[PDB]
Symmetry: C4
Subunit: 220 residues, 4 copies
Amino acid sequence: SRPRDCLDVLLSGQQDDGVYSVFPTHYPAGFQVYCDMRTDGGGWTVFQRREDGSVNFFRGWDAYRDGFGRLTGEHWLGLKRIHALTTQAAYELHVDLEDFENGTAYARYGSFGVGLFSVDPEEDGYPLTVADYSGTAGDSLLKHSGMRFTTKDRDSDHSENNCAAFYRGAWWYRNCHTSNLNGQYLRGAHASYADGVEWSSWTGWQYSLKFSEMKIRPVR
Amino acid sequence: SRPRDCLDVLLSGQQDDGVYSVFPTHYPAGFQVYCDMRTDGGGWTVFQRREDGSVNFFRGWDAYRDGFGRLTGEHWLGLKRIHALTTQAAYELHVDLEDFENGTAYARYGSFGVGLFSVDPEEDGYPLTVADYSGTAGDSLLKHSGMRFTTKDRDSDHSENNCAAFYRGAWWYRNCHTSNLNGQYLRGAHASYADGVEWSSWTGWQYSLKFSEMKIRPVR
Amino acid sequence: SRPRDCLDVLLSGQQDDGVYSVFPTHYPAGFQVYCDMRTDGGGWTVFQRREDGSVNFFRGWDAYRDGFGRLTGEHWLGLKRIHALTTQAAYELHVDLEDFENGTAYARYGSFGVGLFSVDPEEDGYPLTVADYSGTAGDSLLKHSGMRFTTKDRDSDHSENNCAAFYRGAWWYRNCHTSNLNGQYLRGAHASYADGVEWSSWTGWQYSLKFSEMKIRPVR
Amino acid sequence: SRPRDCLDVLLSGQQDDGVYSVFPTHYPAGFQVYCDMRTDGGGWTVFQRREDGSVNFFRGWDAYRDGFGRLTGEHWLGLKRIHALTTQAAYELHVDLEDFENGTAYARYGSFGVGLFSVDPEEDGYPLTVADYSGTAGDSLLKHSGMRFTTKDRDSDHSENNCAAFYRGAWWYRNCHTSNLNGQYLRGAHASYADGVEWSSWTGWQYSLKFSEMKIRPVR
Ligand SMILES: CC(=O)N[C@H]1[C@@H](O)[C@H](O)[C@@H](CO)O[C@@H]1O
Ligand SMILES: CC(=O)N[C@H]1[C@@H](O)[C@H](O)[C@@H](CO)O[C@@H]1O
Ligand SMILES: CC(=O)N[C@H]1[C@@H](O)[C@H](O)[C@@H](CO)O[C@@H]1O
Ligand SMILES: CC(=O)N[C@H]1[C@@H](O)[C@H](O)[C@@H](CO)O[C@@H]1O
Ligand SMILES: *[C@@H]1O[C@H](CO)[C@@H](O)[C@H](O)[C@H]1NC(C)=O
Ligand SMILES: *[C@@H]1O[C@H](CO)[C@@H](O)[C@H](O)[C@H]1NC(C)=O
Ligand SMILES: *[C@@H]1O[C@H](CO)[C@@H](O)[C@H](O)[C@H]1NC(C)=O
Ligand SMILES: *[C@@H]1O[C@H](CO)[C@@H](O)[C@H](O)[C@H]1NC(C)=O
Ligand SMILES: [Ca+2]
Ligand SMILES: [Ca+2]
Ligand SMILES: [Ca+2]
Ligand SMILES: [Ca+2]
């Protein structure tokens, strides 16, 4: 009756993809999430999805903290929820990507967490922890490990300017990025530099992907 | 001990109309509501009621979010509560109306929900979902399906102006409405245009109803 | 393990006066209160106490909502807590008073409640409901029944001015009062008019009491 | 499954030092803390730690209320959490200190609490209660008993000026201090007066300690 995440939902007998209620350890009121019950056995809890550019992702700090969009479409679950999920157990991250040629690729990370040991995850900037890559899209996230989350109105990056504003996104920017999945939905090749839905290791710095989905599942 | 809504209250043995405590899935602290234990078998949870114009309904965003008025009289349960109720199960909507000639009519909708898949229902504007009409008052809500909630201080409608201000109410306005149950209590026929407690399909655009009650009950 | 109030605490075996944890129905996190386990069998939950003028009671709306002072001394439990307590069951009110001549008296009310049917008790002003008097101090509260709570910075009374400011207190003012237990601790007879810790029916309008305690216990 | 503090965690079978989830009585959502499972039998819940000056401790009221830093390094658990912990049972305080010569000392207090009887601990200033000293570092906290917590932006001390600003810290200042563990990490001897990580009874008023850790464990 109180699954902690999508894997619990799956193990309880729910095999279909869809929206379900989960109740993280330190977020007892619970909330709804979209569950991917197919990928590599299923049981993944989605926290990000781009697919048509219908939702504006160039949002400020509060929106990225609380979440926006809709579970059945493009959305960002919200950093407070991602933190509540990732700190209750050891999780891995799966990232699915797709270009405008119907081609697809993915990146899997053995460990993933946000503000794992932060007393106040929000004030500490929801620092990213991620490692152990494997997949077909190549790694475009490891260099971001250890970085705080930065938005257009809250700079915690390692650049003289605001990476989020500069690359029109919101991410665990360093100086500045190798991945920018919350960037502008520019739809394919574009002249501007690395300010679209980018995953450099796969499609470079000037190609805004058509689809992306970030999700997690207990490592053990 | 922890009914999720008025139907649970009824099924537990409480047959009288009145105020009871309910505890929605993602609103564990719970809150009180007025239960209609008579209508078509009973078990309806009320979230809106007009009956004498003693309460001001031309309120702003925060009031419509948190609720106002009193459970035993005119009131609006609050969008955050309606969301917590409607997303925990599939509900239908029953609307009771009465004119100043003691005549009455109703509208029943097979499905009803507010911000059903919104990650942050408040930021997403508590979008309305409603369908499958049947009744005696005629349908005045279907054209509103899919619309966000709009108040005098937060415009999310499809009009060049602010529908809530223009028609002195708060509703899931399009451009602008076919129903306006949270409008001014003008008491019957009135010269102003569609800015009273209107339900066009039944009493037209220039007649402010004497009584209205909106309530929900699990569909299945 | 989860008493709803001081009577539950008593019935569970705790016979000594002191501070205990209680968990109201719609306030699951719970909070601490001072329990009077002696008065007429014991089991009273205190929400107000004056005894030495060490605490400032001429506070604003937020302070009266959230509470101030200390449980072991002068304090105001806070309207949000009083509401959570009184709406979970039918309670009666007991008021103990003492003048500077060591004389004492009391007022008992068969029914007592704050914002009992208010959808949003705070926005509705935590309206007072009280009736059925009996005792030795005389009745100085019945005329206040039905009134909202008023502070120096939030006027909901029936006076052309702000009763709270005028009589230096915080109360369910009408126009203005017969009781003013949250008034200034003027210590006995005073020239100013009715702006001290007054209970008119007993000591008049120009005598600030030395001690007062307001508490509740389930009626049934 | 729901330990109230680090002692419960230990008694349940967890013998290693590390981060664990605890769920205080009036803070049911729970939060994570660092547990010291070695000191005098183990079972201590840490709420403060200095060790390298990597974290800024000259913070304002909200930061000291909500907490900052990281559980695995320098941090302040947050006064709201310390209050939730210390009011659920009788706790004692253990303070470990270390200078830059690798020397160490400690102070143990038989009783410790923050805002123990405050109706609104935050508005009341999280007053300190502490007594019964024993140890090797000498007592530098007893004179602070009874004092409210003061930050650079919220003065509740007994000085004509703001002790927190003057001594660059945050503490239960009187006029002003004998201990200042949240002071500037000045690293050893320093010319400025008592504005570093000081514990006067041991290293005087002009020596900023290298390491400090404050923790609690149920007295009984
Ligand atoms: C996308 C991104 O962050 N690019 C880096 C760096 O790799 C580029 O060479 C540089 C060009 O100005 O901008 C940046 O600092
Ligand atoms: C009540 C309401 O929303 N009326 C519509 C439309 O049906 C009317 O014809 C029009 C008249 O200006 O106003 C509106 O845009
Ligand atoms: C204490 C109090 O509220 N007194 C009333 C009324 O009884 C008095 O006669 C009047 C005198 O101005 O003030 C008031 O309006
Ligand atoms: C650290 C501290 O609080 N010192 C006290 C007092 O002991 C000193 O003598 C005095 C010197 O001005 O400052 C202070 O008021
Ligand atoms: C790509 O896939 C879609 C369905 O997902 C299909 O309709 C389309 O014809 C395919 N080809 C391209 C290049 O769009
Ligand atoms: C209407 O009904 C009320 C009672 O609900 C009754 O008192 C009244 O006489 C009836 N007729 C009219 C037109 O008011
Ligand atoms: C009143 O009672 C107190 C104890 O409560 C006592 O000390 C005192 O002598 C008594 N007389 C007066 C008038 O204070
Ligand atoms: C002090 O202890 C550390 C290890 O904790 C050690 O490396 C060092 O050599 C010791 N001596 C000094 C004075 O640093
Ligand atoms: Ca920057
Ligand atoms: Ca508009
Ligand atoms: Ca007034
Ligand atoms: Ca001062």
